[PDB]
Design a protein around this ligand. Structure first.
Ligand code: T5A
Ligand code: T5A
Ligand code: T5A
Ligand code: T5A
Ligand code: ZN
Ligand code: ZN
Ligand code: ZN
Ligand code: ZN
Lengths: 164, 173, 173, 164
């Protein structure tokens, strides 16, 4: 029946690719899938900034796939409500922000998950080690800052701490 | 090389057994291990009977161990949910090159974050969530712990007399 | 450092997608990747439309690639069950320091070992078996592939017209 | 219902400990377990050299746990027969012998398994790397040779190939 599965890791770890692998796998067995994306960064897709913007539309689907779950403030209630109604809920997210603080409600969701898979990146500094962290490479304080390789890199533990 | 590995799941999932599997594996390669346990959980000792590269300590605060961890290659912290200084302690060790391994419940009986376990996740190179077998329906994996006695507080020491592991359907029933 | 990683499972499990996730991850760290595909499986190309550190080759024997693999950090072999020289090729590369990653069916439609996949297992640093969703009962994970047309031979190219992924109960029914 | 789960890896990887963790987990949910061991190296234990020596006794148990599965010549038929009758079958074994050849029927079982978990040891030569292989440290040819750390060590790939 219902469950919540979490796919976490740093940036550049292919978390969305693993989410969509799980989605495609379900589509092959003719189960219907609703993919929800973050608007500011047998298949339907929606882009929103709050999960309430989707209303009741999720009820018609067997599987819900939430991408970049760190940005949704109502994630926990939304996922449990769906999983309680028998949906397979899958979330892709960063567990940590650039300071390794809990990003959004991701760490809060952990106790509700039937499964949690932490994916690694490859360290983009030493090229020699798995990366579990994200370092911000530009001097901006704010937690939410949208960007890719131009402003963030994945790092191992030794390279995260190099300099500051 | 320094790292933190987290072993989580509900009660009855064999988390300590997995922690000690990782410890025995390191001992075979002659790396030294420091096992730290929570002194107030006395179930094992009060109803059960008694290596060269292994040390064991039982404490209620991780500061009670001071610097002794520095002499060991590997630190293995059991029932990590009960230690308030877990995050700072694990990072300080991992940054000094220790392999830190923690066994803990991620969730309490209400599925609220237990201690600093959920806070540690962003610091971990690895996170393995283990399942139990649901002790109500017997036919589903269990990811949650239900408290079977009517006590509100979060810390309450006990085993199968006071808790059972459950699937999602049986947690809410 | 050299290694072999094996990605197995039944059909419809997204094995190639996981292989390419591992490839894209390496490309982000500017390590170069050589993707090798089986030339006779033309399903993707015959019904579908068309990076700097990536190369792709389509062959029926791994010798058709000669030495070209030596210039790459990572080798990604897709549908490995069809290559007869897989074991020797993967070890030679891994021993020369390549990260070798193979996606393959471990079992054919009779659950017999497909090609040299089962033979490779003892050489692998890692083995991940992926599940599909059972295409018969829709409510169980699938670990097997059933052939839905009456053909005996082992190699028979096709997709969902000719095969479905099944749980254990639905494989035998 | 029925399934076959395989726990493989080199020596010194704690494979039997992971097998027994799965057994203990089942016992907590009052499911009954039959542990079968290799005689030459809610719970019952048997030590045998052939799985036929157990006859029909396995039928009374919910869960079967076969240790050192590499030594049983009838493993595949035995596991499928049980899993087909609705047993949870769990096997702990070496997938490779000291030359990295398939040990017994372990590699043959893979296509029948719902799950396969390969555990690592820590390399007992360089102490610095995970070990996936077993090296024999005494000059004996024969495949079956019972022993522990006195005659075998776990190694990474680089240390397996050191010298010969
Ligand atoms: C550290 C930090 C980050 N962020 C911001 C910066 C970023 O804008 C975003 C990353 O958040 P995420 O890591 O959850 O987002 P994803 O991009 O989903 O993470 P991935 O691991 O998926 O990224 P990769 O770079 O590995 O993805 P890759 O596959 O290499 O890149 C292709 C791009 O296309 C998308 N994509 C990939 N496969 C797709 C598919 N099958 N269908 C649809 N879209 C797909 C991906 O989302 C990615 O952006 O959040 C902050 O605001 N604060 C912070 O402190
Ligand atoms: C849900 C909830 C629980 N609790 C309390 C209740 C308990 O006092 C404690 C459990 O915390 P845990 O689940 O982190 O503790 P463990 O017992 O470590 O978890 P396990 O997953 O290991 O438990 P099992 O019951 O599966 O362990 P098992 O092997 O069955 O039992 C034997 C006991 O012996 C120890 N043990 C087992 N194998 C061992 C080995 N190889 N070496 C040394 N010791 C070993 C284990 O610690 C276990 O408690 O926390 C709360 O206070 N509030 C709550 O909301
Ligand atoms: C059981 C059996 C099968 N076969 C034959 C039938 C087939 O011809 C082939 C399947 O062999 P595979 O299962 O190893 O082949 P894949 O297609 O590689 O397995 P997947 O698990 O990847 O299949 P999916 O169906 O889940 O893949 P999907 O994503 O759904 O489909 C899209 C196709 O595009 C490719 N693709 C998917 N993502 C891609 C990406 N990111 N980049 C490049 N290519 C990508 C994939 O190869 C897939 O075939 O072998 C036999 O000959 N005998 C037998 O007994
Ligand atoms: C490479 C090679 C090996 N062998 C032989 C040599 C050996 O005699 C045997 C190892 O075969 P295995 O690796 O399947 O056997 P296990 O010992 O089951 O492997 P483990 O990974 O479990 O061993 P470890 O050394 O990590 O186990 P450890 O936990 O450190 O050691 C304690 C011992 O007690 C047993 N044990 C451990 N936990 C137990 C529990 N909970 N209940 C009962 N017994 C338990 C274990 O089997 C081990 O022998 O096979 C060959 O004949 N030919 C070869 O080419
Ligand atoms: Zn690095
Ligand atoms: Zn249940
Ligand atoms: Zn089915
Ligand atoms: Zn080594």
């Amino acid at each position: 029946r219902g469950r919540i599965e979490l796919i976490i890791g740093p940036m550049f770890a292919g978390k969305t690719t693993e989410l969509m692998r799980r989605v495609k796998r379900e589509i092959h067995a003719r189960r219907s899938c609703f993919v929800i994306k973050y608007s500011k960064d047998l298949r339907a897709q929606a882009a929103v900034s709050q999960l309430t913007e989707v209303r009741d539309t999720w009820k018609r689907f067997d599987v819900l796939a939430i991408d970049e779950g760190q940005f949704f403030s109502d994630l926990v209630d939304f996922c449990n409500t769906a999983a309680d109604a028998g949906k397979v809920v899958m979330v892709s997210a960063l567990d940590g922000d650039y300071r390794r603080k809990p990003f959004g409600q991701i760490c809060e969701l952990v106790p509700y998950c039937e499964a949690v898979d932490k994916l690694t990146a490859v360290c983009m500094m030493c090229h020699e080690q798995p990366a579990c962290f994200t370092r911000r490479t530009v001097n901006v304080e704010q937690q939410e800052l949208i960007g890719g390789a131009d402003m963030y890199i994945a790092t191992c533990r030794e390279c995260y701490s190099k300099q500051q």
